Amino acid sequence: ASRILLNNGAKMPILGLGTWKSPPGQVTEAVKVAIDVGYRHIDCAHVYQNENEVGVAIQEKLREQVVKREELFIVSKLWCTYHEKGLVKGACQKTLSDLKLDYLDLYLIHWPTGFKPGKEFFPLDESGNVVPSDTNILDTWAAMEELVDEGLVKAIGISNFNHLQVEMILNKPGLKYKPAVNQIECHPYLTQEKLIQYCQSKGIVVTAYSPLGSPDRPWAKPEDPSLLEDPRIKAIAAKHNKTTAQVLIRFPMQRNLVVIPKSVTPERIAENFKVFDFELSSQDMTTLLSYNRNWRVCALLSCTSHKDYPFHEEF
Ligand SMILES: NC(=O)c1ccc[n+]([C@@H]2O[C@H](COP(=O)([O-])OP(=O)(O)OC[C@H]3O[C@@H](n4cnc5c(N)ncnc54)[C@H](OP(=O)(O)O)[C@@H]3O)[C@@H](O)[C@H]2O)c1
Ligand SMILES: CC1=C(CC(=O)O)c2cc(F)ccc2/C1=C\c1ccc([S@@](C)=O)cc1
């Protein structure tokens, strides 16, 4: 069952390709291979610094008539330095330009935290803390809504929002378009039951990022755990004649989540897609859920004093 119906009426493929850390000289081939082997959803962001190269791939596959534009589901994200209402459209248009698209299927507020505008993605002061902007979630949301009305994006959503921040938007005076998606970190070590149930209860689809535990994240430490090497998960994969990665990808799918594993390795791109031919039992699902440790690999530790930092709240 390969697409989920969003609250904007569009169908989103439940498996997509992640692109954070995909080197610019490797990501065009990664996305080409992905489309060839059946991916129809690509997760992008301006801050990843590789959208031009992602776009080359998409355009070549459209030109080759491997796929039609309406069959693709392209996602990107508004970076923190563009939260001011007057900057949102230009940020979207830069992403559209780089991706070689005339619309996005989904555009997310990447984080609830606005930063001072400028050339620096992470403008810093002396204490190691980010320089905020005096922007707020609701005004940025209104600017996102304008993108729908101007035809630049088919759906808007959020990422890394806690349930109180989602509630803020849902309670917005004059709300025109509800968020379609909340994209959050989710894997067996950070199972997210409370936030997922909240979002799903509101008709908001959850996308699970870092489903393999982001082993390539640049701040990984040698003592940190590794989902791909967890012998309990290895054992579940063996029972099914699948890889650990395949179990880690199938897991969120069975929770009615979208999942976006990243790879630049052609064999793994193909492996990661081969997750529609097996099912985890309910007992296996509950067992995987039992591995939760509240272990977050993307904690945005330079922004813990920002007024809108999302991870002080329980969920
Ligand atoms: N919204 C947000 O704030 C946010 C935050 C984080 C991530 N995301 C999105 O979510 C995507 C996925 O998360 P992520 O990039 O953090 O990490 P991930 O998908 O959990 O893990 C990617 C790592 O796993 C490796 N890998 C992939 N498939 C494998 C397989 N079958 N066997 C063994 N190793 C495998 C990759 O290696 P190779 O590439 O070398 O094959 C890479 O090192 C991102 O790329 C981005 O699109 C969003
Ligand atoms: C969590 C995270 C992500 C993941 C993502 O969105 O997919 C990311 C992606 C990028 F392209 C660049 C930075 C980040 C980041 C956190 C982070 C990194 C360095 C700093 S420096 C200011 O010390 C601060 C925060």
**Phi/psi at 207 (nearest 5 deg)?**
-105, 130
Contacts of 156 (CB under 8 A, 6+ apart): 106, 107, 108, 141, 144, 145, 147, 148, 177, 179, 180
Across the strands, what pairs with 207? 183, 258
Which method was it determined by?
X-ray
The amino acid at residue 200 is Q
- All structural domains of the chain: 1-315 (3.20.20.100)
Residue whose C-alpha is closest to residue 6's, from 221, 150, 207, 241: 207
Residue whose C-alpha is closest to residue 135's, from 192, 172, 204, 84: 84
**Which of helix, strand or coil describes residue 96?**
helix
> Is the CB of residue 16 less than 8 Å from the CB of residue 73?
yes
Task: Outline where DSSP puts E strands in 47-169.
Answer: 73-78, 106-109, 156-159
Helices and strands (H and E) in the chain: how many: 10, 10
Cα(260) to centroid(ligand 1), Å: 8
Residue 134: burial class (beta carbons within 10 Å; 0-12, 13-18, 19+): exposed
Query: Has 48 been annotated as catalytic?
Result: yes
Q: Parallel, antiparallel, or unpaired for β 3-5 and 11-13?
A: antiparallel
Task: Outline where DSSP puts E strands in the chain.
Answer: 3-5, 11-13, 17-18, 41-43, 73-78, 106-109, 156-159, 181-185, 205-209, 258-259
Contacts of 147 (CB under 8 A, 6+ apart): 88, 89, 92, 107, 153, 156
The amino acid at residue 107 is Y
- CA dist 306 and 291 (Å) reads 30
DSSP tag of 77: E
The DSSP result for 79-92, as a single string, is -GGG-STTTHHHHH
Cα(37) to centroid(ligand 1), Å: 18
* Ligand 2 close to Cβ of residue 278 (< 6 A): no
DSSP tag of 71: G
Query: What's the number of CA atoms in the CB half-sphere (13 Å) around residue 23?
Result: 4
Lay out the sheet containing 181-185: strands in order across.
17-18, 41-43, 73-78, 106-109, 156-159, 181-185, 205-209, 258-259
Residue whose C-alpha is closest to residue 184's, from 96, 293, 77: 77
> What size, in residues, is the chain?
315
> Is the CB of residue 62 less than 8 Å from the CB of residue 78?
no
- The resolution, in Å, is 1.0
Cα(20) to centroid(ligand 2), Å: 9
- CA dist 45 and 52 (Å) reads 11
Q: How far apart are the first and last CA of the chain?
A: 29
Residue whose C-alpha is closest to residue 124's, from 77, 80, 61: 80
* Ligand 1 close to Cβ of residue 226 (< 6 A): no
- CA dist 147 and 280 (Å) reads 39
- CA dist 53 and 72 (Å) reads 17
- CA dist 152 and 103 (Å) reads 5
In the block, tokens 């969120």 appear at 252
* Ligand 1 close to Cβ of residue 266 (< 6 A): no
User: Residues 16-44, buried b or exposed e (16+ Cβ, 10 A)?
Assistant: bbbbbebeeeebbbbbbbbbeeebbbbbb
Task: Outline where DSSP puts E strands in 79-172.
Answer: 106-109, 156-159
Q: Parallel, antiparallel, or unpaired for β 17-18 and 258-259?
A: unpaired
- CA dist 269 and 265 (Å) reads 6
- CA dist 268 and 262 (Å) reads 9
